[PDB]
Amino acid sequence: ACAVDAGSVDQTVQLGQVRTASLAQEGATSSAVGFNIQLNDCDTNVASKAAVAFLGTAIDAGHTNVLALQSSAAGSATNVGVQILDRTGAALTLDGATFSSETTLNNGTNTIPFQARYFATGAATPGAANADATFKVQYQ
């Protein structure tokens, strides 16, 4: 079979700078930042379709589709998390078993796009937002 492309194993995404005006109330979202997961040596015969599932810590039980930012020495932002969308534009549940939309595996290089976004659960205090997530790939 195939595997995740080299260098896409551990990835970093710079969401940038967002303001409380953009994230002032529950449900407010920032501008999505795109990032792709690359797969190599995936033949059509061995695996026709594939999808990924992101595993992460939810900020609260009510919002299980958004992540939780880690505390920092300088200070961590409050009432805000990171949300991972899909190609269709829908949020992804961070459960280990909830996979994303299927894609057709072209022979050779295959890139799957995603968008990281900010999701504020109430008023967002200023700070630094750093979040982590683990993704697993299934082949069909």
């Binding site: 080299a6 595993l55 810590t57 009510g62 880690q70 280990g96 022979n107 109430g122």
Partner: protein, 680 residues
């Protein structure tokens, strides 16, 4: 009354402000190459070039995809997809001709080649997306309404003495208790609460989604044929928390009708039931008629924001097949029941236990496909650790098939000081251990981070150890996101294998102002054009710099939204001043919008003008036709000018004066020059 008034949603953008784009070509290339050296088979070279062409003329967007593969022994250009997309504003929909896919959720995902017209939700404002209760009320007297969540307020406004409907409430997660509190100037406050729970099939009140797809069926498998088909999908959000959703899938041999209802029961949760009735002719001449019922339940937040449960059941009677089973070859066991049970429980503000259980039984074959997954992710300070367990017992004698995983991420900022200037601050240590519950061990410990000024150069060096075999696999990767493309190089060492990966990705736009290169594109792109401003980095994006002509292309821009494009004035040549360093563009899906900037290239000057030994008054305009520059006198006759020649003259219009000036070469080399020049 607010109900009769045409109040617009929060964050609403008129359709007239939407930018169709520019008439320009497009070409995204992705070349990858792997040199694999093994002691048994010498060395080999693999190459794959993925080329996505495209053309945006008017509003139509033509896109084509091609692949070229090379081994070291022949060249094979292979088309994949070609589609002409467009957006229709009056219908609030998107049309697509040619290849594509069916985004159907009521039916199964289908790849096709034909014409699809489907309603798009991204064109709606972000406020009225997803599911959120609409509040209908009648206020006696002029009142102020504060619809507030269990945590904080959401919607605060003023309502006249009459009926009022509020539909601007955000999604606010899966479950929510919205307390509507109206306060009249005269009467006492009136409060009432409404709880809600959401399911993806639910829609807002008076919200309609439709999809009409027609044409041939395309699949990767060669065995499956290519029959023509039609597919209609409808999703309507009825009043009082109901949803009516149906569909129809028709072909030569397969005729299916889907009907279903969903409900928001409030404190209890959310429900969705649908039935699909299908008459399908199998690959053989035999005909089979069947029904399949899908049940879905979503419990609300049990305890106090601790547990959420999802139960998805599906019963498919003997004689129900999907469209693939019909479209198999001329000559080529159904699912009796599928149960999915998901329980999420948050504890200690740190750990999030996720439990998932799937249980699928077939017809005749009494063997069951049980699948259990238990994940536990915790984030203690900067440390982020995760322990996962999986257990799969399927019909085809998979046995126990257990797995255990442990992943730990430790940032180096946990030890480095807050204001450290060392490059080690942008680094982390990742450690992963995997047991197969059989003695199969997989360790992988490594470092990763970014080590460039703009954090473009991302490095990742990880060693590992796979033990039953005892193979210590090293792994090293360097990615570079520059202003002309993405270049990645990797070296994967094993016991007797050495792989060398190298790839370059990029995008090219042949717009009216020539050819511009940049990072690989992603649907909508913004072309920043600031001629005369070479090597000026744009803000909030990594490694996006203008080329030697001042043209650059942004990879991603949010569609149908107000997105800011700013040029970082700090990393800009001291000889150039931008009239406007921030621009706003609202692009359409797959559109190239120009964010034009004006840049003055001459020296930056600050002039003290005195008229009759009296400083010029506030608000006077000082312009200069020698280099087409303008400025406003601030105070004491101080004016700021950008883009000015060394020796020149300016004209002031307080309510007609001329002032001459000359500057030394040290002054032209200075960042900002200050001089005094008496005016006529």
């Amino acid at each position: 009354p607010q109900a009769f008034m045409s109040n617009r949603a929060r964050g609403y953008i008129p359709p007239e402000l939407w930018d169709p784009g520019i008439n320009a070509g497009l070409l995204n290339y992705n070349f990858s190459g792997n040199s694999v050296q093994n002691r048994i088979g010498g060395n080999s070279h693999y190459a794959y070039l993925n080329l996505q062409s495209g053309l945006n003329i008017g509003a139509w967007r033509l896109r084509d995809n091609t692949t070229w593969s090379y081994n070291s022994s022949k060249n094979k250009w292979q088309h994949i997809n070609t589609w002409l997309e467009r957006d229709i504003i009056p219908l609030r929909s998107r049309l697509t001709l040619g290849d594509g896919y069916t985004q159907g959720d009521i039916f199964d995902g289908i790849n096709f080649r034909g014409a699809q017209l489907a309603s798009d939700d991204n064109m709606l404002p972000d406020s009225q997306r997803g599911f959120a209760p609409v509040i209908h009320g009648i206020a006696r007297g002029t009142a102020q309404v504060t619809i507030k969540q269990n945590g904080y307020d959401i919607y605060n406004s003023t309502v006249p003495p009459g009926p009022f409907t509020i539909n601007d409430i955000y999604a606010a997660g899966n479950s929510g208790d919205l307390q509507v509190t109206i306060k009249e100037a005269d009467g006492s406050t009136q409060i009432f609460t409404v709880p809600y729970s959401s399911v993806p099939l639910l829609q807002r009140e008076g919200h309609t989604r439709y999809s009409i797809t027609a044409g041939e069926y395309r699949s990767g498998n060669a065995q499956q044929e290519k029959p023509r088909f039609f597919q209609s999908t409808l999703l309507h959000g009825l009043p009082a928390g109901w949803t009516i959703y149906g569909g129809t899938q028709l072909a030569d041999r397969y005729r299916a009708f889907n009907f279903g209802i969903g409900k928001n029961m409030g404190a209890l949760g959310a429900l969705s039931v649908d039935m699909t009735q299908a008459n399908s002719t199998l690959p053989d001449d035999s005909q089979h008629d069947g029904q399949s019922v899908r049940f879905l339940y979503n419990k609300s937040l049990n305890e106090s924001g601790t547990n959420i449960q999802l139960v998805g059941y599906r019963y498919s009677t003997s004689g129900y097949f999907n469209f693939a089973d019909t479209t198999y070859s001329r000559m080529n066991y159904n699912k009796r029941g599928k149960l999915q049970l998901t329980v999420t429980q948050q504890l200690g503000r740190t750990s999030t236990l996720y439990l998932s259980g799937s249980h699928q039984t077939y017809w005749g074959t009494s063997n069951v496909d049980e699948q259990f997954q238990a994940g536990l992710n915790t984030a203690f300070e900067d440390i982020n650790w995760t322990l996962s367990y999986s257990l799969t017992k399927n019909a085809w004698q998979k046995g126990r098939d257990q797995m255990l995983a442990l992943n730990v991420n430790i940032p180096f900022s946990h030890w480095l000081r807050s204001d450290s200037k060392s490059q080690w601050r942008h680094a982390s240590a990742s450690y992963s251990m995997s047991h197969d519950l059989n003695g199969r061990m997989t360790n992988l410990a490594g470092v990763y981070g970014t080590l460039l000024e703009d954090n473009n150069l991302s490095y990742s060096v990880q060693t590992g150890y796979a033990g039953g075999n005892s193979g210590s696999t090293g792994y090293a990767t360097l990615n570079y996101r520059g202003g002309y493309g993405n270049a990645n190089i990797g070296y994967s060492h094993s016991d007797d294998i050495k792989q060398l990966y190298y790839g370059v990705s990029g995008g090219v736009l042949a717009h009216a102002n020539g050819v511009t290169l940049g990072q690989p594109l992603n649907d909508t792109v913004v072309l920043v054009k600031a001629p005369g401003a070479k090597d000026a980095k744009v803000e909030n994006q990594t490694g996006v710099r203008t080329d030697w002509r001042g043209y650059a292309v942004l990879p991603y821009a949010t569609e149908y939204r107000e997105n800011r494009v700013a040029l970082d004035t700090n990393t800009l040549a001291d000889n150039v001043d931008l009239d406007n360093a921030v621009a706003n563009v609202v692009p359409t899906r797959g559109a190239i919008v120009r964010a034009e900037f004006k840049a003055r290239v001459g020296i930056k000057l600050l002039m003290t003008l005195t008229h009759n030994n009296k400083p010029l008054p506030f608000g006077a305009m000082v312009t200069s036709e020698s280099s087409q520059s303008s400025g406003i006198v601030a105070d004491n006759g101080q004016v700021y000018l950008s883009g000015m020649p060394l020796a020149g003259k300016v004209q002031v219009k307080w309510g007609h004066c001329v002032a001459n000036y000359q500057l030394p070469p040290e002054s032209q080399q200075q960042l900002l020059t200050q001089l005094s020049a008496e005016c006529r």
